[PDB]
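To assess whether the prediction recovers the assembly geometry, we first specified each molecular entity separately, as shown.
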Amino acid sequence: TRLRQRIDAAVAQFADSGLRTSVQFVGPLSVVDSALADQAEAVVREAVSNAVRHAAASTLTVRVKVDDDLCIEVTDNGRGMPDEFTGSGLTNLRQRAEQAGGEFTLASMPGASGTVLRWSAPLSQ
Amino acid sequence: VTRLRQRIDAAVAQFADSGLRTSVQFVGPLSVVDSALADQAEAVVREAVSNAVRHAAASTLTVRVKVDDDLCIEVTDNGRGMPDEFTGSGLTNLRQRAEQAGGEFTLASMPGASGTVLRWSAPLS
Ligand SMILES: [Zn+2]
Ligand SMILES: [Zn+2]
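The predicted structure of the complete assembly is given in tokenized form:
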């Protein structure tokens, strides 16, 4: 499937050139089947593409962890921009979570002090 | 715990010329790396990143940290037209640390997209 490579590529391709990025892989990425890898790649593409430049320098931190399940967590320390992540990209993350029998959360810290997107799905379901 | 992941991210963010795009990637069990080697890894990243310059075109520095049989730190710079970049005393410093840690160092340059690759590695014990 080449999952690790596809995720690094999606980040390089889709992250606004004004953002710093950091991607960590944890656990056996090989354990992910081709259909779920397809989901994982699209999820990272959606999250990263929807990130925008902020008033100050900011980083998107992506963590892709395969352990009991597959867990993709994107942390954005950029502030403000209340419309960031709220549109069709969010529809698509929720739809992909539903297709995969998984879960999606978007959470924004006090006065928009950073945002976390977490998409998870069972490895087998 | 060494806080290796966080310290590498901070080294890049803090020491990269602010005109460069940065991308950090992590693979393997980072927690396995000892405190002394984590100290080395951090210093290697700061030195390498601090030596990157602005090119005539926009450019990206990608730092990949991989833990398997050994610790491997690869800095890829797609910038062109600065053949003096990364040569000089910063390279001696990297080679010195490689020698001290019982590891290897490579500096490779080629035409096209992966213009320069700096690779520093050291055994875990
Ligand atoms: Zn953002
Ligand atoms: Zn350069």
